[PDB]
Amino acid sequence: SIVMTQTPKFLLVPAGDRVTITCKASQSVNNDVTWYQQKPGQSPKLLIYYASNRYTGVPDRFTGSGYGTDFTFTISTVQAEDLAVYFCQQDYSSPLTFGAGTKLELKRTVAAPSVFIFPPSDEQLKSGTASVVCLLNNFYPREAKVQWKVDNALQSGNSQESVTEQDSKDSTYSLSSTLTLSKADYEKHKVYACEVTHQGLSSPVTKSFNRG
Amino acid sequence: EVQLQQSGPELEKPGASVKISCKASGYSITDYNMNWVKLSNGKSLEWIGNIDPSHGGTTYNQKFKGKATLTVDKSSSTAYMQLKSLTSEDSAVYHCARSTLYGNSAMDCWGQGTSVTVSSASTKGPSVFPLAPSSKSTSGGTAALGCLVKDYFPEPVTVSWNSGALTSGVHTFPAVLQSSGLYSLSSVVTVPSSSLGTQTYICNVNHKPSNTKVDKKVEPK
Amino acid sequence: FYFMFGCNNNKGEGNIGIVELLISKQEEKIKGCNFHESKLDYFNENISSDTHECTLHAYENDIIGFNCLETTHPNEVEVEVEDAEIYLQPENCFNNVYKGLNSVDITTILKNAQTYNINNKKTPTFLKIPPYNLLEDVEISCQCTIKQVVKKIKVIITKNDTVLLKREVQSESTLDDKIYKCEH
Numbered sequence: 230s231i232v233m234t235q236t237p238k239f240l241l242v243p244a245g246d247r248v249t250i251t252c253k254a255s256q257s258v259n260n261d262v263t264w265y266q267q268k269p270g271q272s273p274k275l276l277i278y279y280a281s282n283r284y285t286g287v288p289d290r291f292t293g294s295g296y297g298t299d300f301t302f303t304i305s306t307v308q309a310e311d312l313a314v315y316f317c318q319q320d321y322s323s324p325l326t327f328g329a330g331t332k333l334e335l336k337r338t339v340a341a342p343s344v345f346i347f348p349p350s351d352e353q354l355k356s357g358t359a360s361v362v363c364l365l366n367n368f369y370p371r372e373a374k375v376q377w378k379v380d381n382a383l384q385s386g387n388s389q390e391s392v393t394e395q396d397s398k399d400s401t402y403s404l405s406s407t408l409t410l411s412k413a414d415y416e417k418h419k420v421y422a423c424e425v426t427h428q429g430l431s432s433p434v435t436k437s438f439n440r441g
Numbered sequence: 442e443v444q445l446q447q448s449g450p451e452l453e454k455p456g457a458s459v460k461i462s463c464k465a466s467g468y469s470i471t472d473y474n475m476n477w478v479k480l481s482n483g484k485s486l487e488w489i490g491n492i493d494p495s496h497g498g499t500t501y502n503q504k505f506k507g508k509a510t511l512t513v514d515k516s517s518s519t520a521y522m523q524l525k526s527l528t529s530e531d532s533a534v535y536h537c538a539r540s541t542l543y544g545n546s547a548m549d550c551w552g553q554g555t556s557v558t559v560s561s562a563s564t565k566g567p568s569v570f571p572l573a574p575s576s577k578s579t580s581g582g583t584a585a586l587g588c589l590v591k592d593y594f595p596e597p598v599t600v601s602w603n604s605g606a607l608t609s610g611v612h613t614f615p616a617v618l619q620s621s622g623l624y625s626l627s628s629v630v631t632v633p634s635s636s637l638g639t640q641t642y643i644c645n646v647n648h649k650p651s652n653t654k655v656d657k658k659v660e661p662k
Numbered sequence: 663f664y665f666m667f668g669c670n671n672n673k674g675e676g677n678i679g680i681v682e683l684l685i686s687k688q689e690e691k692i693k694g695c696n697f698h699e700s701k702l703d704y705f706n707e708n709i710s711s712d713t714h715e716c717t718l719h720a721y722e723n724d725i726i727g728f729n730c731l732e733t734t735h736p737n738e739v740e741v742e743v744e745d746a747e748i749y750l751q752p753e754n755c756f757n758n759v760y761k762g763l764n765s766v767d768i769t770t771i772l773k774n775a776q777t778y779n780i781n782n783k784k785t786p787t788f789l790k791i792p793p794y795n796l797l798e799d800v801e802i803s804c805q806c807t808i809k810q811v812v813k814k815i816k817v818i819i820t821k822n823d824t825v826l827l828k829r830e831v832q833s834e835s836t837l838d839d840k841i842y843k844c845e846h
Contacts, residue, residue: 230807230812272536275547324502327478327486329485345574347587348576360570360589362587389617407589436578474762476763492764500764544762546762
């Protein structure tokens, strides 16, 4: 079958700057190519059909070009809400094949995280489990490292992390770290601390609480 | 203008079968070709097949032929897709799309997507817990508060604050899968500290597979 | 070709049945697209490997062909070789035809069409255009995958309100051993 190759896989562009996404085919497809754009948690949306024509209601800033084997998708002025992943599709011969997809990101400036920690709830303690949650917000870049300390003793193998999709409100990352401990182990210690190291911090940032 | 309505998520045993549905409104179903798209791990689109209700003809992608069956109901303006012998590779989100009958086949309208999960762990309901910023050093500046959703399966879970109010400043984190096979999720919201003692914040958690609805209040302690 | 066969009931003191059949050639050319390297003498359009699409115009009582596999010429030694895994979409090419992306049966386009296939060969497939009332210029197509390359055939079914008045073809005479000869 006909196979699309779409490059670059990850593309970075500042807000308000032009960006172009390329597409290459394996055989002549004349003018049967389409482009799709998808938000996280939302269905893909069609932008370009016939590889050079905007679809009804598509903003003028989205354009496409190419014929035969090399096809390009171009955005004249990227917006803050344009954070999405773009796919190409051929409509010449069945089966219709989708491209590998290309993700578009915004740069912005470097920002330091603000750290919060949440103590285990009384309801969870009734079930015999204790969980400590650490919250990080509005930090760039994504490489934020989190470490947990209980009574100044480092913890490993009992924590998990989760990063969001860089919410388009301010194009910054957020990370949450959860430490899972048993109720019996929780009662054996007094001080619970989490250490955060990030590019925007000149020194590690420590938040602590006393509960026990 | 044009709406495509799909069913909720499914959770079947290995080797089972599903029959999802796609309801179309705002246009005549016979006037547009309709197809399904598979999203492998949510990062790679795949074309499954299409059906034309105008003549009943069906076209299936070769590696999906036989494994899937497509049918339409013109009386109800609803179309159905069936999968045979579900395997872990089939666990993906399936979307319904609308396209022209003849000429171009560009997919114009998309549904909200139906998630099909091949059960690798038993069904379980979420446990909602409050996250109180207070009872600590200090709640400087704005006070960030949230809720903890732990030990639920399968995905997804919907979290809302104040019955859909206070949309701004809400951060819902992606779920994390534990060694026990149970997902865990955390959602937080940033509010001014001056409203800690004069405002009520309530988180709504809904889990369709277990039909669990929890409305937990978050207050300082 | 002139032959018989039938049943004989002499041993049971019955009668004898005989069927007399004759077969004669009707036309020498078939308007079909051959995408394979081996050319066909009875196919009007042989398409070079550099070209991946072929377009034809169809009309009543005309035969359309579509070949994407090898053909055994008398210069080739016939042997028992399995047919190549030719990816033909639809599985049957001309009883059900592609009108774009959706498959439609040929009888919905043409009024009671007659189609011919080969039991022991996947391709070629043929269609004889029946008398039809669908005067519109309708497009139908098949496709084959030859050596990981997709070949597509396009057929333009047309029936004008007025048939073409004349079709004049001019040819130049050729000299063959001091004799003026003309092809066709």
